[PDB]
Amino acid sequence: NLQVPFIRSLLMPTTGPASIPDDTLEKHTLRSETSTYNLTVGDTGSGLIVFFPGFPGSIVGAHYTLQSNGNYKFDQMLLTAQNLPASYNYCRLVSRSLTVRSSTLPGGVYALNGTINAVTFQGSLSELTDVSYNGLMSATANINDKIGNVLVGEGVTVLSLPTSYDLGYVRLGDPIPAIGLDPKMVATCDSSDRPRVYTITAADDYQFSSQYQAGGVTITLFSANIDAITSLSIGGELVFQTSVQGLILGATIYLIGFDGTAVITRAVAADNGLTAGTDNLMPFNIVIPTSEITQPITSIKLEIVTSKSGGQAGDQMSWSASGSLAVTIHGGNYPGALRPVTLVAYERVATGSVVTVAGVSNFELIPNPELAKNLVTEYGRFDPGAMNYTKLILSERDRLGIKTVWPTREYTDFREYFM
Amino acid sequence: TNLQVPFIRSLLMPTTGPASIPDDTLEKHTLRSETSTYNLTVGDTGSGLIVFFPGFPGSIVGAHYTLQSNGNYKFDQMLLTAQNLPASYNYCRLVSRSLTVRSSTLPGGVYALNGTINAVTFQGSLSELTDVSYNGLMSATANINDKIGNVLVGEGVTVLSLPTSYDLGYVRLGDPIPAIGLDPKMVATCDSSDRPRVYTITAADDYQFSSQYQAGGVTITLFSANIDAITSLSIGGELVFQTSVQGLILGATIYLIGFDGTAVITRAVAADNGLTAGTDNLMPFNIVIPTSEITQPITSIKLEIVTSKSGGQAGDQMSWSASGSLAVTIHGGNYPGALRPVTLVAYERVATGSVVTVAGVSNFELIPNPELAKNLVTEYGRFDPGAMNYTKLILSERDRLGIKTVWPTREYTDFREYFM
Amino acid sequence: TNLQVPFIRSLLMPTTGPASIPDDTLEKHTLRSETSTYNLTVGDTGSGLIVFFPGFPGSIVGAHYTLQSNGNYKFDQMLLTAQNLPASYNYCRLVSRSLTVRSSTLPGGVYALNGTINAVTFQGSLSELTDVSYNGLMSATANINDKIGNVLVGEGVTVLSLPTSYDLGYVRLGDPIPAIGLDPKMVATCDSSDRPRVYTITAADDYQFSSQYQAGGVTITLFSANIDAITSLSIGGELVFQTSVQGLILGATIYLIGFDGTAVITRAVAADNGLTAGTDNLMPFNIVIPTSEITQPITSIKLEIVTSKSGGQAGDQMSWSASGSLAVTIHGGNYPGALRPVTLVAYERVATGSVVTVAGVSNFELIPNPELAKNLVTEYGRFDPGAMNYTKLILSERDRLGIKTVWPTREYTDFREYFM
Amino acid sequence: VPFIRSLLMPTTGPASIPDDTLEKHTLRSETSTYNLTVGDTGSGLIVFFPGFPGSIVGAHYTLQSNGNYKFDQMLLTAQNLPASYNYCRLVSRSLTVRSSTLPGGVYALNGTINAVTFQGSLSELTDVSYNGLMSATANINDKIGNVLVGEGVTVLSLPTSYDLGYVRLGDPIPAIGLDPKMVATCDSSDRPRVYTITAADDYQFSSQYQAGGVTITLFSANIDAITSLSIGGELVFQTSVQGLILGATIYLIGFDGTAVITRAVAADNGLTAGTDNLMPFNIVIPTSEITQPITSIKLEIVTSKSGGQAGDQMSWSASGSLAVTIHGGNYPGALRPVTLVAYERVATGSVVTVAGVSNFELIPNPELAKNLVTEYGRFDPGAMNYTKLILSERDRLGIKTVWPTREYTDFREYFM
């Protein structure tokens, strides 16, 4: 069941929140809240749990399930108990800790059948090499950041060790007041401090030529590995050239999840005509807000369909393209919003049973104007030398025994040692 | 010379070895010190310009320009480090960096060989100079121990890099990202976009154009502003057009022009744009410019309009109004070091057959890409209390100790002797 | 257990860390420890066997076969290590290996789920044995410390890698070299060339064939010998033919057959080869088979020859003769550990809805390729004095103090509890 | 002398190496001096093979003005050791390059030198450019940057393995032929290096007819050899077009980009339609033909047709794999460790001198065995443990595989 100095809240986050001793000040308050889940288990008794230990507002992780034809499927998102954008504007995270285990049985099975393993990968989600049960341990080279072959009778405890300290406040996806004619019309100020852009040159005079087909020919121009969560903007252009007289052009941009599912589709230009000899342009400028993004994204895709009005059995369709495009993800290079990602993979657990991810997460944050009228904020407490003691205990992380994924028995042993 | 530790020792003499900054940005990283040694090709005139970027976060250390016999400069190459960092690592920030520029020719007589160096560093970027002549470089700044001139090329200079800010996060490098396409010449990279730099420019406020017809069109140029860029950028905005005669088409072309005077990037933003009389006609600017397209630093930008007329073979006129604005965004431009401090080591009239060599050592603090992170351990920076405090003391007490950013190498050798 | 020094602590307890061998092969290297955690899928019969290679040089650990409703087997998958070692490494040798085979099922109330484990090890390779049956496996050796039977799956076995020799050179991993070809799939590797196993085979000594014209051709299997190779092999020889009848055209094909009887790769040596009467007609063997197309381990080779006649009636006799020797060259087979020792763990009749796991660590010494050598630092050993003498003294009397190679996890557990 | 002052300063003399392979041998100290003429524009490059089983110590390349290189000569040693010995074993070696004296009529010395040693071979280098050569390794004491040529470098050879056999040198054997230039030798064979490459995996070629042929290059590689090699394998051809005729040549290419060995494995032997017919590779390259070191291999096929000068599409398919067997590639020293010393912009018309001493350990020719006495080496206990200790503590002491010369001089001063 569940429900101070900075370092006790760092290493033991189920104790209470504390101020960060950094050089960034603001009149803030501080608050802890929880996440408790009973995740149901698919038929192939296996699945993956991503967490985001550094994510500063209200999203703890996600949950996928493995399927009989080797693929994944998106179960749900692991958000927290309180909708933090609904009553706070800015925030900055102090600590997390989460436990995940299954020590208990369904009705009508006579055994337990459990294994898990976990890593904390340094880069983002889509840029790791392979998602296997075996090859997951081969992502980091630190002895402390990973553990494997542990039963689910006593589960692994994911701690949140920090990225960096002098960080400003990041803005939550708070609704701002707005009056519209559409009932499904929302307005919000996003998280945008340190954006992550991707430039993608699609073609350097890539010549295309294919024969006629009734309905058009559909090629896919490129792919990537991009992994946004919150929101993104796709700017740029692509320039066409042609020689054949009459042909129509069309394209669309697909955003794909981690499980392999087309999430968001945007028709950049449907059924527009090309002009022979002279140059011709088609731009795209697409804004994708957070409520459209339902699962985490991976690997953008562009495909172009090309048909001909009045085309017969042998005439040629040919064009050449060049261009570049920019995918700006707002708040992408902030520490914690995308970069540290830990993975938990369970397999062969009994179907019909549940795993139980459950942790605390304490914040440091400032309120919206109504709650600002009714709640009082203040500067943080001051004690000297807590920053040097933080640097001391983190400069010897390898030999002191602090790590970031290790089972609940060893974290319990460390807790009664350190307390 | 013979090229192959706390933060003060690695700050004043960067050839000792790397160290971690005592700032409170405590990530897991790995220290790395690499080097760059060039032997340059002095032209026929004997005079050039070696522009260094001291506090640049990674792998680009300078550019070399030879001045022609007619006054113009000519681009030679882009001075950079031995191992390219974005191919193997993923994030970076700079600790310290030294560069020496001298000759290795050493005559056996009693007299020297002719050639003389000036040097200066200043707070602005590269497009913000009044003059780049050999005489006009010691005008650029007003601090005494921040520029030096008339040093002879047997002695040479030492370019030391004193900092700009300390609690500053990591800059992502232009690393390649896995991608599958159909053109074999496509690349997808992740640029550096921590603190961008925007240049808004109002190109026209109801400007009237009116000229006669002739064959081909009337090519004018609207504006020519000075910008700054080493890496990727993007240009946005639109520009309306009004008229009262209807047979008109027009094209537009944008140029990004480097330091020697030639256009590096040319891209047509409009081509056979037919306009209807009586009402507005838009012309949107949606262009991104990648890093690999940019081969040299870019110091200006200009727009051109070619106004012709469809079926206007007699001698008549054509006219339009225009008004609009532009927003040139470069990515990670206002990061301290990315464009803000620059030095200009210039030499003049070096003898024919003499070489001018560039040595140096760069000290970084990296995070690997996911392939190398399978094999190299990363950890937190070991701390020492008071090294930041002693740094602030020494930099407060700077001008009495005479700690310069440009030196003559005999003076820096004697400083390195009497410091340790 | 939870898969996260002197030499003998890493030799007897490999999950402690990588040590270096204190022999006299002095070479710059780096150390790396690697785990491998599999959960096996059992068949409908609940049987099968796991064929470990304990002293293998790099990254191949074993293969998994399942026992079907008949007496045959079926290849499931090759058991690998965590990260692909020839990716980013050139040379490799092995220090230590521990490996367990146990069930991670917790039984209910008071009784246990059914199933047992039988395990041996022997000095010959995989295709040199006699039988692989569960009962018959137990007689594969005459030592008492190298075999154990009727062990419960609830307390499964433990497998060590006790040494075969010490002064071994490094072996080359199967390592890609840069090559700009003309294909999507154009593999160019540097295979494990060392002390090679060769097999010479004399297929015939004047073997006369005689049969009448069947309407589709008469296929005969000329020989069937037992070779074995995990990696790339080569077979080169000469087979001659001399006839009396005249309208004869014959083709031939050679096979490679895995452990489960299924043919792995088919190679047409010479098809539609017309041969004259009165003259000895030559037929060479010039084929190489790379390690990229050997999916499962090979245990047999055979050759078959089909013959036909131009035209043909019901009574056309077809006759020839043959005499020739063939040599199979397995590149690097006699290196001790690549093929020579093998341990056979064989579970039988596991309860349905139960998992068997296999999990252990490997310790290597290995050289990085031209990129990881740019980015990390290798060095020599540590000079543990007299460690080889203590290793010899422990191994020379392993019969007295009870060091085994396959023995259950309770006895290994309290043995290493006593030994720590 | 003991072994370790023969290893740390090999100008003192040779000594037998203390290990467990014990065999009757003699000890020889062998020198090599060169005065290399330099290119018309300055720069150049000198490879070395510091551990090597005998008689080869490196090669010299000059840099042309249009980017490319040029091979001048192979740097041999003084005595031709395969002329009078069967088996060899390297002990120690030191090589110092320098140019500190002016030619007749110029002033102003003008030079610099980069230097680096590398764990892998020569053909597998990322870049050989003067700046990027420095990043080839990460050991801080296995490279040095921009020393003056008037001070030079010193390249000393630290070992790679100790319990090693004796390499058979490429000595001749008595032989009688009919041509005058009939050579028969017994080259180094033991512990080889194989390259197994697959040239095509169902590659489909199709192009229009040309009067003369249509040439395509199927693959490249980066293999390397010095002494001798051998190539084997076979690849098939299947087609539906009736009367096409093809013929292929294989190539061996030096470091500078110029082909050194070309053998025409198929001279215009055509192929039938409807089945598979197939051409084998079995070529043997002597040591006598390889003049400069190999760096790559390429294959190209010239296909043609009897008549039909309008299109006709010339289709065929290929599938096969090949094997190059370098005879003795994985002896430690024979190909693998390399040092790269790159001088740049030295004075025109001047020299750059090298100086070597290479302590060997030999077995005689059966005539020199008639007149010279071989015996087992002298044994003392503890030289091997001392060698292991000092090689294990390499980083804290100063023991570098490439030195600046004055530092090597005063190192030997406060060592002895």
TrEMBL record, chain D:
The keyword Acetylation does not apply. One of its GO terms (cellular component) is host cell cytoplasm. The keyword Nucleotide-binding does not apply. One of its GO terms (molecular function) is structural molecule activity. It is found in: Virion. Keywords: Capsid protein, Host cytoplasm, Hydrolase, Metal-binding, Protease, Serine protease, Virion. GO terms for biological process: proteolysis. The precursor of VP2 plays an important role in capsid assembly. First, pre-VP2 and VP2 oligomers assemble to form a procapsid. Then, the pre-VP2 intermediates may be processed into VP2 proteins by proteolytic cleavage mediated by VP4 to obtain the mature virion. The final capsid is composed of pentamers and hexamers but VP2 has a natural tendency to assemble into all-pentameric structures. Therefore pre-VP2 may be required to allow formation of the hexameric structures. Structural peptide 2 is a small peptide derived from pre-VP2 C-terminus. It is not essential for the virus viability, but viral growth is affected when missing. Homodimer. interacts (via C-terminus) with VP1 in the cytoplasm. Interacts with VP2. This is Structural polyprotein. It comes from Avian infectious bursal disease virus (IBDV).
